[PDB]
Amino acid sequence: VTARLRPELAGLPVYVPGKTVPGAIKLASNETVFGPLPSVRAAIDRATDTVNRYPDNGCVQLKAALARHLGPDFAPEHVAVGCGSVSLCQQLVQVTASVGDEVVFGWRSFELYPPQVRVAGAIPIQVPLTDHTFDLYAMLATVTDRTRLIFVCNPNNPTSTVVGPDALARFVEAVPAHILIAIDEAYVEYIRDGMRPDSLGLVRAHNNVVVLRTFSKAYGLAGLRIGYAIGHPDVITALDKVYVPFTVSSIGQAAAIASLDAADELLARTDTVVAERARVSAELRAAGFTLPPSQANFVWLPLGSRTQDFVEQAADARIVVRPYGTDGVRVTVAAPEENDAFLRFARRWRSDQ
Amino acid sequence: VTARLRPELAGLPVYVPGKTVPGAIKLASNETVFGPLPSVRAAIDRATDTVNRYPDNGCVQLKAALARHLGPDFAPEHVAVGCGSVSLCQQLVQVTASVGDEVVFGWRSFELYPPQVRVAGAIPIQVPLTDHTFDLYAMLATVTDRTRLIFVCNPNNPTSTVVGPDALARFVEAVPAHILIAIDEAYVEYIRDGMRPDSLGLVRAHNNVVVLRTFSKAYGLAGLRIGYAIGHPDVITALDKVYVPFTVSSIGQAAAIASLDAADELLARTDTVVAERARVSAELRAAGFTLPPSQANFVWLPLGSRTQDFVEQAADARIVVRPYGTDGVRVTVAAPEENDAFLRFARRWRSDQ
Numbered sequence: 001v002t003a004r005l006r007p008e009l010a011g012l013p014v015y016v017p018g019k020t021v022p023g024a025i026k027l028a029s030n031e032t033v034f035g036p037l038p039s040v041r042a043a044i045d046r047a048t049d050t051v052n053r054y055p056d057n058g059c060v061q062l063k064a065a066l067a068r069h070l071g072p073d074f075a076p077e078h079v080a081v082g083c084g085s086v087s088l089c090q091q092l093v094q095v096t097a098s099v100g101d102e103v104v105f106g107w108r109s110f111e112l113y114p115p116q117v118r119v120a121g122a123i124p125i126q127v128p129l130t131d132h133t134f135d136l137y138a139m140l141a142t143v144t145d146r147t148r149l150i151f152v153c154n155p156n157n158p159t160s161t162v163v164g165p166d167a168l169a170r171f172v173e174a175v176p177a178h179i180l181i182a183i184d185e186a187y188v189e190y191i192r193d194g195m196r197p198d199s200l201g202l203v204r205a206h207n208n209v210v211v212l213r214t215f216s217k218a219y220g221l222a223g224l225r226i227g228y229a230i231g232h233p234d235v236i237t238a239l240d241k242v243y244v245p246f247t248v249s250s251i252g253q254a255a256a257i258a259s260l261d262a263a264d265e266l267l268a269r270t271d272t273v274v275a276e277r278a279r280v281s282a283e284l285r286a287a288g289f290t291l292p293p294s295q296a297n298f299v300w301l302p303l304g305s306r307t308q309d310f311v312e313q314a315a316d317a318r319i320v321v322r323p324y325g326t327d328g329v330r331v332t333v334a335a336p337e338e339n340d341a342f343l344r345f346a347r348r349w350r351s352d353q
Numbered sequence: 354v355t356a357r358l359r360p361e362l363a364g365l366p367v368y369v370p371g372k373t374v375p376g377a378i379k380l381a382s383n384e385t386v387f388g389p390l391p392s393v394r395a396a397i398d399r400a401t402d403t404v405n406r407y408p409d410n411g412c413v414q415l416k417a418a419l420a421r422h423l424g425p426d427f428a429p430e431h432v433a434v435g436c437g438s439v440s441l442c443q444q445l446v447q448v449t450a451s452v453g454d455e456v457v458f459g460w461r462s463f464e465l466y467p468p469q470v471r472v473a474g475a476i477p478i479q480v481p482l483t484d485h486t487f488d489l490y491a492m493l494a495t496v497t498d499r500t501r502l503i504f505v506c507n508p509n510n511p512t513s514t515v516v517g518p519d520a521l522a523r524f525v526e527a528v529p530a531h532i533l534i535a536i537d538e539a540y541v542e543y544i545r546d547g548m549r550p551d552s553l554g555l556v557r558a559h560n561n562v563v564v565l566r567t568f569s570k571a572y573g574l575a576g577l578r579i580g581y582a583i584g585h586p587d588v589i590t591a592l593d594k595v596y597v598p599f600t601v602s603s604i605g606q607a608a609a610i611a612s613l614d615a616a617d618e619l620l621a622r623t624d625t626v627v628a629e630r631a632r633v634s635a636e637l638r639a640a641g642f643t644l645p646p647s648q649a650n651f652v653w654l655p656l657g658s659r660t661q662d663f664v665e666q667a668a669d670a671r672i673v674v675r676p677y678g679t680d681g682v683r684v685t686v687a688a689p690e691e692n693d694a695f696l697r698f699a700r701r702w703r704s705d706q
């Protein structure tokens with residue numbers, strides 16, 4: 001006899017990290033490459049003084065700062081904070097979907113959507129992509145009476161691509177207005193080529209749109225775990241009901257506030273990443289690789305059954321990239337010397353095939 | 354029209370941030386009063402250098418340190434880590450209970466038990482205490498075909514009491530073996546008078562027992578959010594399947610490992626708390642208050658309908674204590690001069706009744 005656990009746990013699609021290759025160049029986690037600004041370390045140092053005290057559960061000053069950052073139409077009541085946007089992903093399922101309810105998203109997409117939906121006893125509706133891109137028409141066709149939540153990942157992880165900004169608006173307009181739609185905008189700060197949607201305009205115009213963002217990437221605080229959701233006050237209130245209390249640390253909040261104060265400098269750095277992304281993409285395509293147009297801080301290599309081998313051999317060259325089954329490899333765009341090292345590996349590996 | 358959210362959210366509380374008055378004495382969150390040791394600050398400071406990188410999702414070094422700390426009977430496979438033990442409480446519900454299922458606990462007890470159970474669509478079976486203590490017999494009598502999880506909070510929050518250590522073993526031996534039992538031991542470090550149960554021994558002897566502990570109180574890291582569970586490897590594996598990835602921060606892991614290195618010093622400090630707890634209890638009893646025997650870092654005042662008034666008047670005197678409905682007030686034992694300020698207020702308040 002053992003402790004009886006839920007049958008849903010059986011072969012639950014777990015998030016598995018990449019194995020650590022000591023000293024390897026880290027192109028597997030979509031991290032930016034710079035340590036904290038002086039003002040961010042100072043805020044962290046000051047917050048370290050009171051590590052014996054619980055954080056502000058309501059993240060009051062952080063919400064105020066976020067609403068200010070967001071603009072005049074946004075107040076603290078429109079903002080929920082979570083322990084990474086990954087926590088907010090689960091909170092969205094928890095406020096919308098239970099047993100038998102359906103959650104729709106393009107697939108392949110963020111690897112945590114399926115397990116988080118399954119943990120709730122809900123049914124993941126995984127809609128195939130075309131041109132490695134969310135197919136909004138196919139997703140809409142997939143809606144039923146049991147649909148309680150839709151995830152639009154934009155840019156998409158792991159395929160790197162974006163939908164058209166007006167297409168997104170038409171999609172939102174077409175979805176029954178009582179179904180919550182979450183636009184996961186983890187890489188929104190890297191979009192260029194006039195493809196960035198009117199994210200805030202959409203939440204202003206639609207009560208059922210919620211936008212998710214993160215401090216982990218462009219704002220460089222992946223280690224400290226701060227994400228936020230922007231939406232209608234009733235949606236925000238619900239997210240905070242299921243929020244596990246105190247999960248956003250005091251150091252996290254302090255660092256996040258200091259980072260918003262330095263947004264202009266931090267956002268400006270994304271230009272350099274975009275330039276390197278364009279260069280890495282061009283050189284890969286020149287060497288014979290196929291990949292879609294990226295609007296994030298990584299590219300997607302649909303290598304199929306060669307995925308495992310690519311990633312194993314990269315690891316032999318002290319380079320860590322992220323495999324996805326037998327679909328493809330996601331490679332983060334990092335510092336120029338690091339990207340060149342990846343490129344030398346890629347060209348050699350290609351020639352050998 | 355608004356987004357349709359789960360109706361079960363009506364069973365969950367909204368918290369609303371109360372006043373944050375400068376100079377108020379903080380006796381409402383069960384916190385210890387000392388800031389970080391030099392070695393803990395150093396761990397935090399060094400992990401800050403790489404805040405742009407994600408944490409170790411598997412908390413490998415922290416689990417190894419916990420397994421050491423636990424001794425030769427326990428390996429990393431017996432340990433799950435969570436973003437505070439509050440996160441692990443939810444994870445326990447997620448591996449055991451869904452719609453229709455029953456979760457048993459004493460009541461009044463940890464304020465998070467009911468909402469976390471409601472979130473899963475499960476039903477909380479709230480069993481009345483006897484003399485402000487868990488009634489283990491009454492709890493056993495409430496067990497049914499639908500019972501998937503039992504919480505025993507020991508010491509109990511908010512009533513401060515423990516069950517007999519031998520009685521706890523008898524109860525565990527008597528519970529049907531397929532039912533997971535969680536022993537919440539957030540205040541275990543404060544138990545004295547021969548009342549500490551053989552917590553680890555219960556884990557070793559029963560596949561269905563899990564123990565929850567925290568770095569928030571005795572180890573003084575409430576701000577950083579690290580809890581842990583000790584259990585059978587298959588239960589631990591399950592907890593880690595529903596674990597929200599990267600929620601335990603890099604700074605949190607670094608700080609916890611360093612605190613474990615300083616366990617002797619940190620644990621030695623609990624003796625002073627216990628001395629204050631006894632003094633506070635005696636002084637309250639001389640003033641005419643009746644309270645049960647505490648084994649935590651707080652005392653419980655069963656003031657019934659007078660609790661709201663007590664707490665409000667304390668707040669006017671710049672003292673923060675925690676109300677629990679019309680049941681009672683939980684008062685943290687902290688620095689002697691804070692405790693004296695509280696006692697002066699309590700004495701005045703009582704003589705005014």
Ligand SMILES: Cc1ncc(COP(=O)(O)O)c(CN[C@@H](Cc2ccccc2)C(=O)O)c1O
Nearest residue numbers: 029084085086110153157184186214216227598
């Ligand atoms: C599309 C998308 N949404 C959310 C998140 C989570 O970011 P957070 O704000 O929680 O740091 C990501 C991030 N993806 C990375 C890292 C990761 C984090 C949690 C779980 C799995 C992976 C990745 O490697 O996929 C994202 O892309």
Ligand SMILES: *Cc1c(COP(=O)(O)O)cnc(C)c1O
Nearest residue numbers: 437438439463510539567569580
């Ligand atoms: C304080 C407390 C905890 C610990 O919470 P953390 O999330 O570890 O800070 C757990 N359980 C109970 C009943 C408590 O009172």
Ligand SMILES: N[C@@H](Cc1ccccc1)C(=O)O
Nearest residue numbers: 057245246368382439464465
């Ligand atoms: N989350 C509640 C209750 C709580 C207190 C302490 C720990 C966990 C939960 C609060 O704001 O205080």
